[PDB]
Amino acid sequence: LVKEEIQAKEYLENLNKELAKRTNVETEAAWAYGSNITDENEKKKNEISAELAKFMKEVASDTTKFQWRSYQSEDLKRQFKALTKLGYAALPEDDYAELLDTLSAMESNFAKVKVCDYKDSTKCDLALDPEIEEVISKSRDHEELAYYWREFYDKAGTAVRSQFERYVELNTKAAKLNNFTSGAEAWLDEYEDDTFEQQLEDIFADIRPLYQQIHGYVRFRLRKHYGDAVVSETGPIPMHLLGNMWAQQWSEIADIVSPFPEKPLVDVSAEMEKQGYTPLKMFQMGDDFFTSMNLTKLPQDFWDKSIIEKPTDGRDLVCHASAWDFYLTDDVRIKQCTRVTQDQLFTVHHELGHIQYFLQYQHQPFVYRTGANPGFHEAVGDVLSLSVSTPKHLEKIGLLKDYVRDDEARINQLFLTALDKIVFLPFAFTMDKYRWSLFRGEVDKANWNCAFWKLRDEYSGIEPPVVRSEKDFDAPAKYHISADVEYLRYLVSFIIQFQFYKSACIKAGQYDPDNVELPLDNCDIYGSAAAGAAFHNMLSMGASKPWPDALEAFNGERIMSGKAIAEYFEPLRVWLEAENIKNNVHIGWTTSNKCVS
Ligand SMILES: *[C@@H]1O[C@H](CO)[C@@H](O)[C@H](O)[C@H]1NC(C)=O
Ligand SMILES: *[C@@H]1O[C@H](CO)[C@@H](O)[C@H](O)[C@H]1NC(C)=O
Ligand SMILES: [Zn+2]
């Protein structure tokens, strides 16, 4: 049994190596398909996934040869337990193949959406990225906005209802084969905490009043721009006016809702273009931020194999930005259809945070080469982006000029940041609240579409521009819903990234709550080896320990907390509460009239 444990340790070392080797090729096939959507690439991706699922079944069976619950090493026991968890690979081979086909159909559908131009309906080659996203972000023609909203949701959402239904069924079947009640419990398993969902309810409830104030002010300002017939005083905000196809962040309309329109609003896109920025330069700058913190420089494979601008050959691909670990040493890549904008610069850092994480844990055994939890993975790059976005940093790198950081400019900047960070929280929560409700069998198929919009109303106080019904199916028009990517990770990320940022800022000498010269919202951790060390300590652990141990390695904390994010926006909360009372701004909303059961 001491002998058996020694044998089990060698068995796991070899198994992890083999899993990394096989997953490398699965990842190559997935990369090929995602960068070039073809029936041939789809078939190879799905065959290799099927072969790997069959291997995982064998692995799970082989683990029963070892009396691993009697072993001394908690590490070995953790590895064995992770290797017993089959997920979708628990499905019978025919069901697994059908699930893969279903997922590919939805992903292909999303990637291939083309719409007709509003001004000339004979031009029908407008894609989400970049053409439709450009219109939704920049047009202030409410009819044009509503047209693109409808065309996109009809094609990206409604077209895949039947595939989505079958996916829900197979996801549920898989979950029950793994002894989870549903796919909701399967997803929640990744956080290794039986109170995790309630913890999020509690944090969300604390931040919700600030969201209500932001919502009310934005509606007030939208109504002043568009008039009562377009934006009602008391109803949910028509979502097509919020600058984003899913209304998940509202910073693209900052020029119609900024607190002080006479005072500066940071948008460095023009200066980036004036200075001849390219996607390459943007990625080089991100790399430089990480190396400035004494973290790992991007390896040669990254530069040689990444795709950092949209192809011009007219093939179909998934343009949704992503970061890829190929499970060797130093083979890590990003695929991004990069444009030279402030928003895209943040996305670059977001994706490079994933890459940094891959590099930091690449010597862990294969089973531990992943995030402490899914939210940790999403948070890394956003911590850097918070620094990148500060007037302090943008002035230093020459992208922001003639900027006086007076009280009004500060409110503009905090408000802009809140349009990205606070507004996203109810959005992110609803993406999984909706799917969990379907996974759990709590909504009859007859009510699936209005269940989606009811949640979007309840939590975000937004609604479609036009009346929808159960003849539409709108949820899959969000990438992650069509792609079967869990979304709670982003809610978790948006909370914990402020915990990481606050701690890194203190370690860098960039934040002191008692010093007016060092406010949290102007902290730049660029150049801080001390902040980098904290990242190294956490990120190098991968998934070797439960996430509270990874957090503790960073800053001694073990608890997920909304204190930091509230602290960041406290100056905005004070101003905004006073401003809404001053202007008699209506808070809250009536139930939406936009979904017919
Ligand atoms: C796209 O993939 C197909 C194989 O499915 C291939 O014939 C074609 O050359 C590929 N294009 C690129 C740019 O890789
Ligand atoms: C920087 O990182 C290297 C590599 O991890 C480490 O050995 C060294 O201690 C760090 N240097 C500083 C100044 O923190
Ligand atoms: Zn991400």
XYZ file of C-alpha atoms and ligand atoms in Angstrom:
626
model
C 0.000 0.000 0.000
C 3.044 2.237 0.578
C 4.312 0.347 -2.507
C 1.013 0.884 -4.343
C 1.216 4.647 -3.668
C 4.721 4.844 -5.159
C 3.404 3.007 -8.254
C 0.355 5.341 -8.417
C 2.648 8.402 -8.398
C 4.543 7.084 -11.462
C 1.233 6.097 -13.083
C -0.109 9.672 -12.685
C 3.105 11.259 -13.974
C 2.888 9.163 -17.155
C -0.872 9.629 -17.516
C -0.585 13.427 -17.168
C 2.138 13.452 -19.846
C -0.049 11.413 -22.201
C -3.109 13.599 -21.546
C -1.067 16.719 -22.347
C 0.198 15.082 -25.566
C -3.293 14.103 -26.747
C -4.890 17.376 -25.615
C -2.198 19.252 -27.600
C -3.509 17.684 -30.825
C -7.179 18.223 -29.852
C -6.213 21.867 -29.309
C -4.504 22.080 -32.744
C -7.687 20.759 -34.381
C -9.888 23.182 -32.416
C -7.539 26.057 -33.357
C -7.675 25.120 -37.072
C -11.488 25.060 -37.022
C -11.789 28.298 -35.033
C -9.370 30.127 -37.340
C -10.884 28.621 -40.523
C -14.411 27.190 -40.349
C -14.758 24.316 -42.839
C -16.622 21.014 -42.810
C -13.228 19.276 -43.034
C -11.822 21.157 -40.034
C -15.046 20.520 -38.077
C -14.845 16.756 -38.720
C -11.188 16.521 -37.568
C -11.905 18.549 -34.405
C -14.873 16.371 -33.541
C -13.124 13.045 -34.321
C -10.149 13.878 -32.113
C -12.455 15.023 -29.291
C -14.405 11.766 -29.584
C -11.165 9.748 -29.389
C -10.042 11.690 -26.343
C -13.427 11.164 -24.620
C -13.073 7.403 -25.163
C -9.560 7.610 -23.617
C -10.949 9.515 -20.606
C -13.533 6.768 -20.030
C -10.664 4.242 -19.931
C -8.709 6.476 -17.522
C -11.682 6.767 -15.144
C -12.035 2.977 -15.172
C -8.250 2.470 -14.685
C -8.241 4.658 -11.540
C -10.396 1.999 -9.789
C -7.298 -0.304 -9.811
C -5.725 2.035 -7.221
C -6.954 2.227 -3.595
C -6.287 5.962 -3.797
C -8.652 7.024 -0.991
C -6.246 5.211 1.388
C -3.146 7.087 0.152
C -1.199 9.535 2.281
C -0.600 12.191 -0.391
C -3.426 14.724 -0.626
C -1.837 15.844 -3.901
C -2.156 12.356 -5.463
C -5.708 12.070 -4.145
C -6.569 15.440 -5.686
C -5.169 14.304 -9.049
C -7.059 10.984 -8.970
C -10.331 12.710 -8.061
C -9.940 15.269 -10.897
C -9.281 12.372 -13.313
C -12.455 10.560 -12.205
C -14.557 13.569 -13.357
C -15.577 12.807 -16.947
C -17.927 15.680 -17.768
C -19.277 15.244 -21.305
C -16.975 12.230 -21.821
C -19.369 10.262 -19.567
C -21.918 10.211 -22.408
C -22.237 7.118 -24.601
C -20.160 7.553 -27.775
C -23.202 8.202 -30.041
C -24.543 10.876 -27.636
C -21.086 12.440 -27.336
C -20.771 12.656 -31.131
C -24.241 14.220 -31.366
C -23.359 16.793 -28.662
C -20.156 17.705 -30.567
C -22.187 18.090 -33.796
C -24.713 20.274 -31.962
C -22.004 22.554 -30.503
C -20.297 22.881 -33.904
C -23.607 23.781 -35.558
C -24.184 26.603 -33.040
C -20.593 27.913 -33.205
C -20.558 27.799 -37.007
C -23.934 29.556 -37.096
C -22.722 32.351 -34.855
C -19.463 32.766 -36.803
C -21.208 32.909 -40.208
C -23.920 35.504 -39.363
C -24.078 38.156 -42.096
C -26.643 40.973 -42.301
C -27.803 43.481 -44.913
C -26.819 47.134 -44.678
C -29.551 49.486 -43.360
C -28.852 52.223 -45.935
C -28.386 49.846 -48.916
C -30.102 46.498 -48.379
C -28.350 44.903 -51.402
C -25.062 44.838 -49.456
C -25.481 41.736 -47.291
C -21.973 40.882 -46.105
C -21.842 42.774 -42.792
C -20.451 40.612 -39.983
C -20.778 41.176 -36.245
C -17.044 41.824 -36.025
C -16.355 44.523 -37.171
C -19.291 45.973 -39.121
C -22.337 45.452 -36.909
C -20.392 46.147 -33.695
C -19.230 49.456 -35.257
C -22.831 50.555 -35.909
C -24.134 49.563 -32.468
C -21.185 51.287 -30.772
C -21.238 54.565 -32.805
C -24.634 55.214 -34.453
C -27.128 57.425 -32.607
C -29.934 56.705 -35.063
C -32.400 54.725 -32.930
C -34.137 53.163 -35.984
C -30.817 52.076 -37.513
C -29.792 50.615 -34.154
C -33.108 48.694 -33.869
C -32.745 47.333 -37.396
C -29.281 45.835 -36.718
C -30.399 44.530 -33.304
C -33.287 42.645 -34.945
C -31.279 41.303 -37.898
C -28.481 40.064 -35.680
C -30.638 38.442 -32.976
C -32.860 36.760 -35.565
C -29.808 35.163 -37.220
C -27.516 34.509 -34.232
C -30.310 33.535 -31.816
C -33.511 32.217 -33.320
C -31.838 30.165 -36.071
C -30.272 27.743 -33.540
C -33.243 27.085 -31.186
C -33.500 23.371 -32.066
C -29.724 22.760 -31.720
C -29.781 24.631 -28.415
C -32.678 22.484 -27.148
C -30.802 19.293 -27.983
C -27.630 20.697 -26.329
C -29.603 21.348 -23.124
C -30.866 17.737 -23.173
C -27.388 16.222 -23.704
C -25.759 18.577 -21.183
C -28.377 17.431 -18.654
C -27.810 13.741 -19.514
C -24.041 14.176 -19.076
C -24.456 15.914 -15.713
C -26.646 13.131 -14.302
C -24.115 10.507 -15.507
C -21.543 12.359 -13.358
C -23.936 12.420 -10.333
C -24.771 16.118 -10.618
C -28.419 17.197 -10.539
C -27.862 19.247 -13.715
C -25.288 21.123 -15.760
C -25.669 24.018 -13.305
C -24.208 21.891 -10.523
C -21.563 20.595 -12.946
C -20.463 24.166 -13.664
C -20.622 25.201 -10.005
C -18.321 22.256 -9.128
C -15.418 24.253 -10.614
C -15.503 26.657 -7.630
C -15.035 23.918 -4.961
C -17.337 25.744 -2.536
C -20.865 24.618 -1.634
C -21.916 28.183 -0.676
C -20.421 29.862 -3.784
C -23.675 30.864 -5.459
C -25.056 32.362 -2.214
C -21.762 34.271 -1.727
C -22.339 35.825 -5.153
C -25.991 36.630 -4.326
C -24.767 38.472 -1.206
C -22.047 40.456 -2.985
C -24.412 41.287 -5.844
C -27.090 42.463 -3.378
C -24.492 44.835 -1.838
C -23.539 46.382 -5.207
C -27.068 46.420 -6.683
C -28.043 49.838 -5.208
C -25.037 51.451 -6.960
C -26.117 49.749 -10.207
C -29.658 51.176 -9.758
C -28.170 54.682 -9.406
C -26.022 54.239 -12.548
C -28.963 52.774 -14.452
C -31.227 55.684 -13.440
C -28.692 58.337 -14.420
C -28.000 56.714 -17.805
C -31.746 56.420 -18.547
C -32.213 60.077 -17.520
C -29.424 61.147 -19.916
C -30.612 58.870 -22.758
C -34.113 60.325 -22.418
C -32.683 63.870 -22.606
C -30.935 62.876 -25.848
C -33.589 60.692 -27.520
C -36.876 61.995 -26.012
C -39.765 60.298 -24.190
C -41.198 58.331 -27.115
C -37.840 56.543 -27.555
C -36.783 56.275 -23.850
C -39.515 56.171 -21.181
C -38.872 57.699 -17.744
C -39.994 54.652 -15.773
C -39.531 51.657 -18.120
C -36.513 49.397 -18.754
C -33.863 50.995 -20.998
C -34.160 50.056 -24.690
C -30.955 48.019 -24.932
C -30.044 49.014 -28.501
C -29.190 52.520 -27.230
C -26.503 51.284 -24.797
C -23.653 50.910 -27.331
C -23.224 47.133 -27.077
C -25.215 44.353 -28.798
C -25.941 42.603 -25.434
C -25.933 45.777 -23.294
C -23.233 44.097 -21.192
C -21.160 47.278 -20.917
C -22.185 50.817 -21.830
C -18.907 52.719 -22.255
C -19.470 53.217 -26.020
C -22.221 55.795 -25.202
C -20.035 57.710 -22.719
C -20.198 60.770 -25.015
C -23.984 61.054 -24.497
C -24.091 60.185 -20.754
C -20.845 61.607 -19.284
C -21.404 63.555 -16.012
C -19.421 66.586 -17.236
C -19.526 66.945 -21.035
C -17.388 70.146 -20.947
C -14.608 68.210 -19.117
C -12.303 65.513 -20.493
C -13.511 61.974 -21.206
C -10.619 59.570 -21.802
C -10.775 57.911 -25.234
C -7.266 57.205 -26.514
C -8.311 55.459 -29.802
C -7.574 58.600 -31.882
C -4.100 59.098 -30.358
C -3.299 55.395 -30.917
C -4.179 55.887 -34.621
C -2.334 59.244 -34.848
C 0.803 57.520 -33.520
C 0.568 54.645 -36.028
C -0.368 51.926 -33.533
C -0.913 48.499 -35.020
C -2.171 45.247 -33.508
C 1.488 44.130 -33.251
C 2.411 47.245 -31.262
C -0.615 46.742 -28.990
C 0.502 43.161 -28.154
C 4.117 44.365 -27.704
C 2.864 46.941 -25.196
C 0.952 44.268 -23.288
C 4.057 42.058 -23.225
C 6.029 45.038 -21.904
C 3.544 45.563 -19.047
C 4.051 41.957 -17.865
C 7.880 42.042 -18.176
C 7.885 45.423 -16.326
C 6.377 43.546 -13.353
C 9.129 40.895 -13.642
C 6.629 38.388 -15.089
C 7.264 36.139 -18.071
C 7.963 37.545 -21.537
C 5.992 36.079 -24.452
C 7.840 33.174 -26.121
C 8.748 33.029 -29.814
C 5.918 30.562 -30.624
C 3.404 33.235 -29.566
C 4.625 35.724 -32.148
C 5.059 33.103 -34.897
C 1.648 31.401 -34.556
C -0.840 33.933 -33.101
C -3.488 35.526 -35.321
C -3.793 39.162 -34.243
C -5.829 40.686 -37.068
C -8.869 39.551 -39.010
C -7.934 37.535 -42.137
C -8.630 39.369 -45.437
C -9.187 36.266 -47.630
C -12.937 36.162 -46.816
C -12.924 32.769 -45.061
C -15.231 32.173 -42.121
C -13.714 32.133 -38.628
C -14.556 32.782 -34.998
C -13.435 36.386 -34.383
C -14.369 36.307 -30.685
C -11.030 36.995 -28.949
C -9.388 34.010 -27.272
C -6.198 32.655 -25.724
C -4.936 29.108 -26.297
C -2.669 26.812 -24.293
C -1.192 24.020 -26.437
C 0.058 22.037 -23.397
C 3.716 21.693 -24.391
C 6.341 24.232 -23.284
C 5.950 27.801 -24.579
C 3.360 27.030 -27.316
C 0.728 29.596 -26.391
C -1.303 31.723 -28.842
C -3.947 34.401 -29.118
C -6.552 34.707 -31.848
C -7.943 38.265 -31.956
C -9.478 40.296 -34.783
C -7.697 43.291 -33.311
C -8.647 46.889 -34.053
C -6.763 49.983 -32.889
C -9.076 51.237 -30.123
C -8.965 51.861 -26.385
C -11.441 49.018 -25.813
C -9.344 46.635 -27.897
C -6.205 47.592 -25.941
C -8.002 46.379 -22.785
C -9.013 43.140 -24.580
C -5.360 42.595 -25.571
C -4.352 42.738 -21.902
C -7.261 40.505 -20.950
C -6.116 37.821 -23.419
C -2.449 38.240 -22.414
C -3.458 37.550 -18.796
C -4.635 34.099 -19.921
C -1.292 33.609 -21.691
C 0.685 34.685 -18.603
C -1.280 32.170 -16.529
C -0.498 29.356 -19.045
C 3.213 30.149 -18.856
C 3.247 30.426 -15.044
C 1.782 26.956 -14.493
C 3.224 25.078 -17.489
C 5.466 22.863 -15.282
C 2.493 21.681 -13.166
C 1.136 18.222 -14.011
C -1.401 18.401 -16.839
C -4.463 18.125 -14.551
C -3.305 21.272 -12.675
C -2.599 23.337 -15.828
C -5.724 25.467 -15.482
C -6.979 28.309 -13.289
C -7.428 28.051 -9.527
C -11.040 28.639 -10.533
C -12.485 29.878 -13.859
C -12.827 33.423 -12.517
C -9.101 33.650 -11.654
C -8.224 33.008 -15.286
C -10.492 35.848 -16.462
C -9.259 38.305 -13.796
C -5.479 38.348 -14.428
C -5.451 40.512 -17.537
C -8.199 42.806 -16.280
C -6.017 43.792 -13.305
C -3.430 45.104 -15.768
C -6.175 46.782 -17.844
C -7.401 48.657 -14.771
C -3.858 50.131 -14.531
C -3.589 50.701 -18.296
C -6.870 52.674 -18.204
C -5.703 55.198 -15.564
C -4.918 58.767 -16.644
C -1.581 58.164 -14.852
C -0.622 55.291 -17.134
C -2.032 56.760 -20.371
C -0.175 60.042 -19.762
C 3.060 58.130 -19.072
C 2.893 56.227 -22.397
C 1.901 59.363 -24.382
C -1.676 58.361 -25.295
C -3.375 61.035 -23.137
C -2.361 64.704 -23.500
C -3.367 68.026 -21.933
C -5.297 66.169 -19.210
C -6.108 67.980 -15.970
C -7.299 65.536 -13.317
C -9.717 67.805 -11.444
C -12.798 66.549 -9.543
C -15.076 66.635 -12.614
C -12.574 64.734 -14.796
C -12.250 62.156 -11.995
C -16.034 61.667 -11.892
C -16.106 61.275 -15.690
C -13.368 58.611 -15.451
C -14.936 56.721 -12.514
C -18.281 56.827 -14.313
C -16.711 55.520 -17.554
C -15.086 52.694 -15.598
C -18.427 51.889 -13.920
C -20.093 51.645 -17.339
C -17.671 48.746 -17.955
C -17.396 47.198 -14.469
C -20.593 47.755 -12.443
C -23.050 47.503 -15.351
C -21.602 44.105 -16.340
C -22.366 42.460 -12.968
C -26.122 41.878 -13.382
C -25.554 41.015 -17.056
C -23.022 38.312 -16.202
C -25.201 36.898 -13.418
C -28.186 36.533 -15.779
C -26.222 34.640 -18.453
C -25.838 31.697 -16.056
C -29.017 32.221 -14.036
C -30.847 31.714 -17.343
C -28.889 28.623 -18.393
C -29.025 27.094 -14.895
C -32.810 27.470 -14.966
C -32.957 25.544 -18.284
C -30.410 22.957 -17.108
C -32.445 22.377 -13.938
C -35.713 21.862 -15.893
C -37.339 24.835 -14.188
C -38.699 26.438 -17.372
C -41.002 24.673 -19.855
C -39.700 24.867 -23.478
C -42.806 26.925 -24.375
C -41.515 29.758 -22.085
C -37.756 29.732 -22.817
C -37.528 33.059 -24.653
C -39.597 35.208 -22.323
C -37.756 33.570 -19.394
C -34.543 35.073 -20.852
C -35.926 38.597 -21.235
C -37.658 38.429 -17.838
C -34.273 37.826 -16.176
C -32.648 40.600 -18.236
C -35.439 42.976 -17.083
C -35.369 41.875 -13.426
C -31.585 42.211 -12.980
C -30.387 44.764 -15.558
C -33.522 46.865 -16.248
C -32.995 46.614 -19.985
C -35.216 45.289 -22.760
C -35.285 44.558 -26.474
C -35.904 47.482 -28.855
C -38.930 45.704 -30.330
C -41.474 43.194 -29.076
C -40.205 39.622 -29.065
C -42.114 36.420 -28.467
C -41.625 32.665 -28.149
C -41.234 32.582 -31.946
C -37.814 34.187 -31.306
C -34.988 32.611 -29.366
C -32.583 35.293 -28.302
C -30.141 33.794 -25.754
C -27.775 32.174 -28.336
C -27.106 35.605 -29.910
C -24.516 35.959 -27.112
C -21.323 34.164 -28.184
C -20.798 32.237 -24.947
C -24.334 30.838 -25.057
C -23.858 29.514 -28.635
C -20.340 28.324 -27.707
C -21.277 26.573 -24.395
C -18.837 28.681 -22.337
C -19.774 29.084 -18.679
C -20.281 32.801 -17.824
C -20.210 32.977 -14.001
C -16.395 33.089 -14.351
C -16.811 36.706 -15.585
C -18.990 37.698 -12.617
C -16.389 36.129 -10.296
C -13.611 37.873 -12.256
C -15.186 41.335 -12.027
C -15.383 40.998 -8.219
C -11.984 39.438 -7.539
C -10.023 41.579 -10.046
C -10.582 44.523 -7.683
C -9.224 42.419 -4.780
C -6.129 41.661 -6.850
C -5.868 45.272 -8.033
C -6.186 46.798 -4.547
C -3.543 44.411 -3.167
C -1.147 44.849 -6.111
C -1.567 48.635 -5.839
C -0.679 48.584 -2.114
C 2.346 46.358 -2.854
C 3.429 48.833 -5.589
C 3.117 51.893 -3.261
C 0.307 53.148 -5.524
C -2.629 53.112 -3.091
C -3.137 54.535 0.386
C -6.713 55.286 1.478
C -5.424 58.090 3.781
C -3.355 59.799 1.038
C -5.321 61.942 -1.445
C -2.377 61.686 -3.905
C -2.738 57.858 -4.150
C -6.403 57.107 -4.936
C -7.233 53.551 -6.028
C -8.707 54.763 -9.355
C -5.329 56.258 -10.495
C -3.074 53.341 -9.490
C -0.520 52.117 -12.028
C 1.243 48.853 -11.156
C 3.521 49.148 -14.213
C 7.140 48.474 -13.186
C 6.281 46.792 -9.849
C 8.302 43.631 -9.222
C 6.462 43.405 -5.887
C 3.056 43.203 -7.627
C 4.574 40.695 -10.089
C 5.825 38.465 -7.256
C 2.303 38.231 -5.836
C 1.032 37.174 -9.289
C 3.869 34.674 -9.672
C 3.069 33.088 -6.282
C -0.637 32.659 -7.153
C -0.465 31.879 -10.868
C 2.339 29.289 -10.626
C 0.022 27.093 -8.508
C -2.449 26.437 -11.328
C -5.241 24.223 -9.974
C -2.931 22.288 -7.584
C -4.858 23.656 -4.599
C -8.406 24.949 -4.000
C -8.766 28.592 -5.035
C -8.700 30.108 -1.525
C -5.095 28.828 -1.275
C -4.237 30.554 -4.568
C -5.794 33.820 -3.324
C -3.900 33.439 -0.042
C -0.605 33.108 -1.937
C -1.374 36.493 -3.568
C -2.412 38.655 -0.592
C -3.141 36.432 2.432
C -6.929 36.561 1.835
C -9.068 33.437 1.514
C -12.504 34.984 1.025
C -14.095 36.391 -2.125
C -15.279 39.902 -1.206
C -16.941 42.916 -2.839
C -15.213 45.355 -0.444
C -12.538 46.304 -2.988
C -14.906 47.000 -5.888
C -17.190 49.089 -3.599
C -14.112 50.965 -2.310
C -12.987 51.732 -5.870
C -16.354 53.311 -6.788
C -17.189 54.930 -3.426
C -16.415 58.480 -4.725
C -18.756 57.820 -7.684
C -21.539 56.465 -5.432
C -21.504 59.652 -3.325
C -21.568 62.017 -6.326
C -24.165 59.977 -8.221
C -26.637 59.659 -5.316
C -26.462 63.465 -4.875
C -26.788 64.091 -8.625
C -29.846 61.846 -8.992
C -31.643 63.511 -6.054
C -30.677 66.975 -7.406
C -32.119 66.180 -10.855
C -35.083 64.186 -9.483
C -33.906 61.102 -11.422
C -36.318 58.167 -11.351
C -34.799 54.945 -9.930
C -36.045 51.439 -10.709
C -38.264 50.246 -13.514
C -41.652 48.790 -14.417
C -41.885 45.294 -15.898
C -41.097 45.197 -19.640
C -43.835 45.136 -22.296
C -41.442 43.631 -24.896
C -41.963 39.825 -24.659
C -45.274 38.188 -25.600
C -45.893 34.785 -24.028
C -9.016 26.431 -44.616
O -9.071 25.026 -44.434
C -9.149 24.258 -45.621
C -9.187 22.796 -45.193
O -10.417 22.559 -44.550
C -7.977 24.541 -46.572
O -8.227 23.955 -47.837
C -7.715 26.046 -46.710
O -6.482 26.260 -47.363
C -7.689 26.694 -45.320
N -7.323 28.105 -45.358
C -6.360 28.633 -44.590
C -6.104 30.103 -44.761
O -5.690 28.005 -43.769
C 12.080 38.327 -10.705
O 11.653 37.063 -11.153
C 12.676 36.094 -11.191
C 12.165 34.879 -11.964
O 10.995 34.389 -11.351
C 13.057 35.790 -9.744
O 14.036 34.774 -9.689
C 13.577 37.054 -9.058
O 13.629 36.798 -7.672
C 12.683 38.274 -9.306
N 13.363 39.549 -9.108
C 12.882 40.547 -8.345
C 13.705 41.803 -8.268
O 11.828 40.496 -7.704
Zn -11.005 35.608 -20.927
